[PDB]
Amino acid sequence: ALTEKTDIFESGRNGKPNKDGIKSYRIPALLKTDKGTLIAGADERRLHSSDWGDIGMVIRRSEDNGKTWGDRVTITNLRDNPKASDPSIGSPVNIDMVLVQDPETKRIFSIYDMFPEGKGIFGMSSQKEEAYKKIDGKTYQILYREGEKGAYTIRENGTVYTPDGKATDYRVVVDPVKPAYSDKGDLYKGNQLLGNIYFTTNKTSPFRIAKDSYLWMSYSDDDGKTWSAPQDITPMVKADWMKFLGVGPGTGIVLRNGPHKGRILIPVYTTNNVSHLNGSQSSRIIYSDDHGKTWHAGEAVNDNRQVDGQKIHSSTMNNRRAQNTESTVVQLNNGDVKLFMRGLTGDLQVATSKDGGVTWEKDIKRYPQVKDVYVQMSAIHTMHEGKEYIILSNAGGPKRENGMVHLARVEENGELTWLKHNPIQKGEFAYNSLQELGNGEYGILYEHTEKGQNAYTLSFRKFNWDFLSK
Amino acid sequence: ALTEKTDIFESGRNGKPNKDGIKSYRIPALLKTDKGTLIAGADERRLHSSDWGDIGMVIRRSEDNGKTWGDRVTITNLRDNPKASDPSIGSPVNIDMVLVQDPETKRIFSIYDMFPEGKGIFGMSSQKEEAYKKIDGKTYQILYREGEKGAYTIRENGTVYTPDGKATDYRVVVDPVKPAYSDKGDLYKGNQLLGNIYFTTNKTSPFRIAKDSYLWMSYSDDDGKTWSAPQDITPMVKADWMKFLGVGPGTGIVLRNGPHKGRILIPVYTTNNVSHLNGSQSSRIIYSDDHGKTWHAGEAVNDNRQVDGQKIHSSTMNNRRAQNTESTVVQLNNGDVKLFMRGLTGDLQVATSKDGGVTWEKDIKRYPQVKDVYVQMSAIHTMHEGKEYIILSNAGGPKRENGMVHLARVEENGELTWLKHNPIQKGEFAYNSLQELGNGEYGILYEHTEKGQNAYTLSFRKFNWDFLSK
Ligand SMILES: CC(=O)N[C@H]1[C@H]([C@H](O)[C@H](O)CO)OC(C(=O)O)=C[C@@H]1O
Numbered sequence: 001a002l003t004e005k006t007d008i009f010e011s012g013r014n015g016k017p018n019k020d021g022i023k024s025y026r027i028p029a030l031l032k033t034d035k036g037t038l039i040a041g042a043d044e045r046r047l048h049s050s051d052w053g054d055i056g057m058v059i060r061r062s063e064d065n066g067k068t069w070g071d072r073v074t075i076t077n078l079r080d081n082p083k084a085s086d087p088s089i090g091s092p093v094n095i096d097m098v099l100v101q102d103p104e105t106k107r108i109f110s111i112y113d114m115f116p117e118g119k120g121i122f123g124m125s126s127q128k129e130e131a132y133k134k135i136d137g138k139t140y141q142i143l144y145r146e147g148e149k150g151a152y153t154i155r156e157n158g159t160v161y162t163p164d165g166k167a168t169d170y171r172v173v174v175d176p177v178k179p180a181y182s183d184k185g186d187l188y189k190g191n192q193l194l195g196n197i198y199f200t201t202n203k204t205s206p207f208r209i210a211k212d213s214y215l216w217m218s219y220s221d222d223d224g225k226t227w228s229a230p231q232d233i234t235p236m237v238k239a240d241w242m243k244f245l246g247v248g249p250g251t252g253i254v255l256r257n258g259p260h261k262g263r264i265l266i267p268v269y270t271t272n273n274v275s276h277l278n279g280s281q282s283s284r285i286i287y288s289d290d291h292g293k294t295w296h297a298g299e300a301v302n303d304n305r306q307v308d309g310q311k312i313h314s315s316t317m318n319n320r321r322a323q324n325t326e327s328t329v330v331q332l333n334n335g336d337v338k339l340f341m342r343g344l345t346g347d348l349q350v351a352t353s354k355d356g357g358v359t360w361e362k363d364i365k366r367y368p369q370v371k372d373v374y375v376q377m378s379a380i381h382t383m384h385e386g387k388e389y390i391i392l393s394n395a396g397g398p399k400r401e402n403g404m405v406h407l408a409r410v411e412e413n414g415e416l417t418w419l420k421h422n423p424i425q426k427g428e429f430a431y432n433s434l435q436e437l438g439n440g441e442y443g444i445l446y447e448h449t450e451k452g453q454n455a456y457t458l459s460f461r462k463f464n465w466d467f468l469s470k
Numbered sequence: 471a472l473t474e475k476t477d478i479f480e481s482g483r484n485g486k487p488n489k490d491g492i493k494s495y496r497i498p499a500l501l502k503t504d505k506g507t508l509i510a511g512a513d514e515r516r517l518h519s520s521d522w523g524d525i526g527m528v529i530r531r532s533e534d535n536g537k538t539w540g541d542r543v544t545i546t547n548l549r550d551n552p553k554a555s556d557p558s559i560g561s562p563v564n565i566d567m568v569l570v571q572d573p574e575t576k577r578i579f580s581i582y583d584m585f586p587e588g589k590g591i592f593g594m595s596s597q598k599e600e601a602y603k604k605i606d607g608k609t610y611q612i613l614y615r616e617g618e619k620g621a622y623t624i625r626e627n628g629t630v631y632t633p634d635g636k637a638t639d640y641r642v643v644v645d646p647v648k649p650a651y652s653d654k655g656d657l658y659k660g661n662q663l664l665g666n667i668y669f670t671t672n673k674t675s676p677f678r679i680a681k682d683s684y685l686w687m688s689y690s691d692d693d694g695k696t697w698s699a700p701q702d703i704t705p706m707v708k709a710d711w712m713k714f715l716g717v718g719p720g721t722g723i724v725l726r727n728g729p730h731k732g733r734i735l736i737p738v739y740t741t742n743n744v745s746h747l748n749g750s751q752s753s754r755i756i757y758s759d760d761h762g763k764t765w766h767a768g769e770a771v772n773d774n775r776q777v778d779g780q781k782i783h784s785s786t787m788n789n790r791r792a793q794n795t796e797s798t799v800v801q802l803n804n805g806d807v808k809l810f811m812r813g814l815t816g817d818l819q820v821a822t823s824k825d826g827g828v829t830w831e832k833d834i835k836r837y838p839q840v841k842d843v844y845v846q847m848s849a850i851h852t853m854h855e856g857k858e859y860i861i862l863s864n865a866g867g868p869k870r871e872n873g874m875v876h877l878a879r880v881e882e883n884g885e886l887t888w889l890k891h892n893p894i895q896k897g898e899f900a901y902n903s904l905q906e907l908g909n910g911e912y913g914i915l916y917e918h919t920e921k922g923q924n925a926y927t928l929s930f931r932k933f934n935w936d937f938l939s940k
Pocket residue numbers: 027051095096113120121246277281325326375
């Protein structure tokens with residue numbers, strides 16, 4: 001059996017905003033917390049549906065295990081540029097979240113992309129501006145002044161600082177904010193405002209950050225009810241050559257066994273300056289061994305990998321077919337990590353790691369039993385009456401439609417046997433996130449539209465083992 | 471006055487190897503030391519005059535102000551691949567050197583390029599191979615093993631470690647090297663010599679280093695009679711995005727003024743993976759503030775540089791004309807650093823640093839009164855009775871011909887106004903290196919051909935100044 005859909009994030013209708021003024025909801029993430037709570041995350045795309053604009057990172061909570069859901073809690077929404085001529089592209093952007101709970105600390109992390117005002121990924125500059133500087137062993141974000149060339153950093157209490165190293169006070173950027181963090185990056189000269197460092201057009205202040213892709217994180221210590229101010233984790237994980245670095249949205253994992261047990265894995269992907277979105281999309285994970293304090297980049301699956309007798313690297317590649325993008329991560333009972341990667345083979349592409357996410361084996365396994373129409377997927381480990389299984393959910397196709405939940409037995413070394421492919425949602429079907437619910441039940445937050453819904457409405461369903469196996 | 475042609479590094483004739491079977495000599499570097507000694511350095515290009523093959527770093531000394539010269543002392547020459555099916559491209563390569571002396575320590579530095587077997591610069595791999603890896607960092611050089619993906623590292627005493635971090639113990643590379651350092655890189659299984667980590671063709675050992683460009687350093691404390699084993703400085707200065715990193719050959723300086731007195735400046739240039747040789751050649755310096763122990767990279771002249779309306783970076787640029795390659799550096803008495811860069815404008819190109827070679831000013835000064843036929847140049851600071859004077863020497867044109875010596879008056883602001891341009895050599899003329907001999911006398915080692923000489927024969931000329939004035 002399978003429950004009827006419960007709509008958790010309701011988008012507007014026929015191009016028009018909903019009751020709150022919001023046209024679109026988008027990128028689902030679902031988390032089952034130690035307290036038994038269900039946390040549902042999404043992009044709140046106010047006016048409109050594209051991969052940019054006024055977008056907030058929002059969650060909702062359920063305590064009755066998915067029956068009823070509380071209020072929308074906004075984690076982060078950066079304030080729009082009020083003097084931008086095109087308001088649909090006139091806001092700093094947060095986009096795509098990953099959720100994970102550290103089982104030791106009970107801390108819940110939401111990691112998500114950040115772009116200043118622009119078209120977030122489809123609006124990146126073709127030239128690099130340095131985003132960060134290491135002054136005397138400490139890393140500070142850079143600022144670029146109008147007309148002037150040179151450093152400018154952000155130190156101490158948001159006190160700016162000239163390329164001279166002179167504490168040119170008057171100037172402060174806010175980073176211990178305050179309201180719902182919409183005032184992050186606000187620039188003051190005195191007690192009076194001015195502008196915001198994430199503003200790109202028609203600026204009322206002289207300072208902006210570098211035009212780049214960024215990676216932010218916020219945490220909750222009260223089961224998802226209140227969230228910390230965004231931590232900029234970018235410099236810990238982003239290399240000099242990297243153009244884009246963003247999350248593979250959905251739900252991350254904590255390793256439960258082997259010598260790296262307790263390691264947090266967050267799926268991510270990069271583009272390089274050689275081919276950007278045309279032929280360099282490359283999956284990897286970032287990880288933390290200290291309960292979310294510091295983060296590190298693992299190697300890309302495409303690093304030192306052989307395609308057609310020629311080795312590639314994610315920093316230099318230009319090959320459309322060899323890309324792998326958004327991914328979903330799972331650990332086996334034998335300690336292996338499997339990375340299910342969105343790609344362009346029409347097939348399920350899977351990478352294998354032996355050292356817990358850092359390095360990847362030579363070959364990408366392909367399963368013709370599971371279609372991939374170039375859309376996000378979620379997969380989870382689950383134990384049923386002995387051993388062992390993985391549950392994977394994505395569009396059946398052709399196109400982003402006919403939602404499928406696929407069931408595989410985990411064999412031996414460490415092989416997968418696809419046992420059944422059960423339809424879960426007819427009509428439009430895109431992004432989705434699976435969770436184990438306890439007691440042989442499972443949950444899913446997925447993208448789907450009906451009856452003129454804008455794109456997308458995010459909906460929840462429970463199901464049991466019978467729905468999966470017969 | 472001007473002294474007649476005095477050859478130091480004699481090339482061959484009409485495609486014949488000279489007395490010692492060395493067809494070609496190339497890339498002059500001239501240094502006068504603390505004891506008054508002159509050092510002349512060259513590419514010992516044994517097999518041809520191309521930018522690859524079997525090349526040794528060699529010097530010849532003079533105690534008598536360049537009257538007569540001592541014999542050849544090989545700094546470094548890596549042994550050839552005896553199994554390579556083409557000897558002309560069948561050797562690990564060293565190429566281009568900078569000479570410089572620390573005034574306080576008297577240590578003389580030779581900084582030069584290195585490539586494994588191949589066409590060094592004209593034969594670089596299309597895709598990135600990681601060359602180094604931090605482990606409890608601790609940075610080690612990577613080895614790749616035929617048939618396998620995965621690190622392999624060179625650790626203590628040259629012991630090869632497996633990608634897992636297990637000692638192969640058996641496998642070891644020669645790091646403290648002995649002979650002419652010709653055994654550097656040799657790979658052993660115990661006392662069994664198998665091959666060399668710098669060979670890339672028809673290999674006899676299982677391991678090779680990354681196909682990349684490297685930057686090596688040797689030093690002598692005995693005024694140039696013996697030299698240490700090559701030190702690999704690459705990982706201190708070469709960023710991840712960099713394809714090529716190599717020196718602007720000739721002679722370096724030490725800062726004598728300002729808040730950075732004692733800093734050693736080595737001119738270098740980089741390429742990127744977007745356009746490599748076709749549009750990315752970018753001049754910068756590397757420097758040492760601790761007497762040549764540790765090195766750091768300065769920012770490129772092309773970093774955040776407004777050109778043709780747009781801002782570029784050395785890591786992302788594709789602009790042929792905006793390139794700046796080999797360069798020579800001088801400090802002014804007001805503390806400014808000037809960088810004369812080989813370019814493709816036909817003009818002389820000059821950039822200014824006000825923080826001792828790290829950052830560069832918005833603007834590149836073009837001096838039409840001075841020609842540049844896209845070839846290396848040489849410049850030195852020199853006081854004579856007044857203020858302030860710089861000598862710049864290069865080709866006259868059209869083509870690599872007519873050795874010119876130009877003089878400029880260093881104004882206080884501090885621009886420079888050119889006074890006279892005097893021919894020092896007729897015929898075909900290319901690379902050169904200038905020094906200050908004292909008593910208002912100057913010396914120049916340069917590149918020249920006559921009587922069917924293989925190119926080049928590298929000749930010396932001593933003289934002032936009435937040549938410059940009158
Ligand atoms: C940060 C961002 O833009 N993420 C978006 C992603 C990305 O643009 C694409 O993977 C580029 O190749 O595309 C999609 C999509 O519905 O297909 C949704 C994400 O919101």
